C-alpha cells in the first residue's frame, strides 16, 4: 500500500479485483469467490477435502450485528420503605441472658 492507487500500471486500470493491505485470508476468500463466479474449472477434492472449506476464510461467521435484545436479571427490587425506626433503653425489659 506504499504505492498510491494512481500509478498501478498502464494496461491494468480497467481491471479492479482486490488489494491486500487488510489481511491475507479475506483476500483468499474474495479470490475464491471471484474464481467461482467466473467458473474456473473444477477439481476433485479426493473425498478428504471440504474440511478446509470452513477455516480457509479468516473468520467462520464472527461479525458484529446491531440488533437489540433483552435479558432477565436475578435481583428483585423494593419500592416503599418505612419512614423511621424506633429507639429505647430500659435495661430490664427481658432477662439479660435471655436471647432476642
Amino acid at each position: 500500500e506504499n504505492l498510491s492507487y494512481d500509478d498501478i500500471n498502464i494496461e491494468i486500470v480497467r481491471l479492479n479485483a482486490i488489494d491486500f493491505k487488510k489481511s491475507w485470508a479475506k483476500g483468499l476468500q474474495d479470490l475464491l469467490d471471484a474464481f467461482e463466479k467466473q467458473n474456473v474449472p473444477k477439481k476433485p477434492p479426493d473425498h478428504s477435502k471440504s474440511n478446509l472449506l470452513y477455516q480457509q476464510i479468516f473468520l467462520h461467521d464472527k461479525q458484529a450485528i446491531e440488533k437489540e435484545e433483552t435479558y432477565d436479571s436475578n435481583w428483585f427490587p423494593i419500592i416503599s420503605f418505612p419512614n423511621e425506626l424506633r429507639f429505647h433503653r430500659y435495661d430490664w425489659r427481658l432477662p439479660k441472658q435471655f436471647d432476642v
Binding site: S23, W24, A25, N51, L52, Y54, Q55, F58, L59, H60, D61, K62, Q63, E69, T70, Y71, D72, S73, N74, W75
Partner: protein, 448 residues
C-alpha cells in the same frame, strides 16, 4: 433497564506480521513466529512407559481430527504446523529400578515415601546431566500426592527444563475400571490435547509461538498474589509478584521479579513498608536498565484490597511523575443473567458500569465462530475497581480483556481471568516447597 456496553476483541500477532483471533486457527494458517528445531528428548521410567511414549510419538506425526470440527479446528502433522523434526529415533533412555526400595503400601510414612521417590528421581537426573556426553533439552517423566512441587523445587538449582506426563493419559483405551469400562474417555479432545502438548513442548524448547504488538508504548504492568506458608508460626508472606511488559526493541518482555519478601504476621495480608519499597525498586530497576529511561505509567494488579500506608511509602518512589494506579479483582459476585428468549446464554464482551470506579465484565459466554459456550451453565462475570489512582474507566476494562490471551500453558480461545495473576499463583506453590534458595531464576520456562 440500563443499556450495556460492548468492547471489541483485540487480535494477536503471527508470522509475517499478520493478525488473527483463535491461536490455533493462526497456527494452522501460518504457524510460529521464531524458528526452533532442537527437540532432542530424553525419557526416564519403566519399559511400559517408554514403549507407550514411543507409540504416542510415532502416532502424533499424522494429522488427526476430533469428533466435531466446527468448534475445534483441524490438527495437521507436527512438521506441517510448526516446522521441525520430532522423532522417537533420537531419545536417550534410562531405566528406573524394577524392584522397589520403597515399600509398596503407604504404611510407614507417605511423606517419607514421596521424599524417597523424589530423591531417587532427582539424583538420577543430576547424574545423567553431570555424567553423560549427549545434549538434551526436555525430559518426559512417566509415573507408574503433592509430588511435583518437591521435584521442581529441587531441580530449580540446576536450571534444567522438565515436563511431567501420567501413565493414565495415553492408555485410556485399555485402562478399564473395576467393571471393565474405561475410567477416562478422550474420544473428543484428542486433537486439542495434541495441540496443547505440542505448544508446551515448543515453548519449553525455547521458542515463543506468538507475541503482542498492539500495546501502548512506555507503560508497564505488574501483578501480586498472596499465599500462606505454614512451618512453625504460619507466617503468611508470599509476595511472589509476577511478570511485566516493559517496552523493548519490538518484543514482549515476560520476566518476573521474584523473591518472597517476608511479611511476619498470621492475619495481616496486605503489605509492609520496607518490603513494599524493596519490591517496587526491584520491579523498577529492570525497566531502568533495559530501556535506559523511565516509565510514563505504572499499573498494579491485586487479587485483594490493600492498606494505605503502603501508598504513603510508594509516593516517594515515583521518580518525577510516573504515578502508579492500583486495581483489585475478585472472582465471585452473584449476578447470573438470563436471556429473554430461546435457550442460549449471553456472549463475552459486554461490560456494565455503575460509576467512574466499579465495573462488571463478562469474560465468559459464547462466541459465534465457535457456535458453542465457554461454560457449562450460565456464566457469571467478574468485578473490577480502581482502588488507588485516577484513570479512564474503559481503559482498564479493555486492558484486562486484552491480557486474557497470553496463556502459554494451553491453547484455549480465552481464559476466565488475566494471566498476570495466574502465573504468579502458579509459581507460588512450587517455589514454597523449599525456600532455602537464594536469587532464584527469573525466566518463566523453568517454572511451569
Amino acid at each position: 433497564m440500563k443499556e450495556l456496553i460492548y468492547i471489541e476483541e483485540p487480535s494477536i500477532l503471527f508470522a509475517h506480521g499478520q493478525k488473527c483471533t483463535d491461536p490455533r486457527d493462526g497456527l494452522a494458517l501460518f504457524g510460529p513466529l521464531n524458528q526452533i528445531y532442537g527437540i532432542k528428548s530424553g525419557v526416564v521410567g519403566t519399559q511400559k512407559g517408554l514403549q507407550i511414549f514411543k507409540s504416542y510419538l510415532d502416532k502424533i506425526q499424522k494429522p488427526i481430527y476430533n469428533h466435531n470440527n466446527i468448534t475445534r479446528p483441524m490438527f495437521p502433522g507436527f512438521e506441517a504446523v510448526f516446522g521441525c523434526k520430532w522423532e522417537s529415533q533420537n531419545i536417550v533412555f534410562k531405566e528406573i529400578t524394577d524392584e522397589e526400595i520403597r515399600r509398596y503400601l503407604f504404611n510407614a510414612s507417605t511423606h517419607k515415601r514421596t521424599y524417597d521417590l523424589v530423591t531417587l528421581f532427582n539424583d538420577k537426573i543430576i547424574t545423567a546431566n553431570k555424567n553423560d556426553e549427549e545434549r538434551v533439552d526436555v525430559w518426559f517423566v512417566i509415573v507408574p500426592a503433592q509430588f511435583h512441587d518437591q521435584l521442581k523445587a529441587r531441580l530449580l538449582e540446576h536450571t534444567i527444563p522438565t515436563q511431567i506426563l501420567r501413565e493414565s493419559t495415553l492408555a485410556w483405551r485399555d485402562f478399564k475400571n473395576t467393571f471393565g469400562a474405561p475410567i477416562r474417555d478422550f474420544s473428543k479432545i484428542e486433537g486439542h490435547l495434541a495441540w496443547t502438548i505440542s505448544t508446551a513442548a515448543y515453548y519449553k524448547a525455547g521458542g515463543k509461538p506468538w507475541k503482542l504488538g498492539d500495546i501502548r508504548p512506555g507503560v508497564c504492568y505488574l501483578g501480586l498474589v498472596y499465599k500462606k506458608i505454614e512451618k512453625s508460626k504460619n507466617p503468611q508472606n508470599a509476595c511472589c509478584a509476577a511478570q511485566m511488559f516493559l517496552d523493548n526493541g519490538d518484543g514482549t518482555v515476560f520476566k518476573g521479579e521474584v523473591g518472597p519478601w517476608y511479611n511476619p504476621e498470621k492475619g495481616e495480608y496486605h503489605l509492609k513498608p520496607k518490603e513494599a519499597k524493596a519490591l517496587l525498586t526491584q520491579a523498577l530497576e529492570s525497566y531502568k536498565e533495559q530501556n535506559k529511561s523511565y516509565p510514563k505509567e505504572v499499573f498494579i494488579h491485586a487479587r485483594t484490597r490493600f492498606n494505605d500506608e503502603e501508598w504513603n511509602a510508594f509516593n516517594e518512589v515515583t521518580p518525577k511523575n510516573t504515578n502508579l494506579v492500583g486495581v483489585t479483582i475478585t472472582k465471585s459476585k452473584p449476578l447470573k443473567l438470563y436471556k429473554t428468549e430461546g435457550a442460549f446464554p449471553i456472549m463475552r464482551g459486554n461490560a456494565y458500569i455503575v460509576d467512574e470506579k466499579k465495573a462488571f465484565l463478562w469474560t465468559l459466554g459464547f462466541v459465534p465462530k465457535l457456535q458453542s459456550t465457554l461454560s457449562m451453565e450460565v456464566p457469571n462475570p467478574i468485578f473490577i475497581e480502581i482502588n488507588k489512582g485516577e484513570a479512564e474507566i474503559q481503559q482498564v476494562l479493555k486492558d484486562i480483556l486484552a491480557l486474557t490471551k497470553l496463556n502459554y500453558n494451553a491453547c484455549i480461545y480465552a481464559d476466565g481471568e488475566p494471566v498476570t495473576l495466574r502465573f504468579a499463583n502458579k509459581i507460588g506453590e512450587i517455589l514454597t516447597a523449599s525456600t532455602e534458595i537464594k536469587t532464584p531464576p527469573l525466566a518463566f520456562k523453568y517454572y511451569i
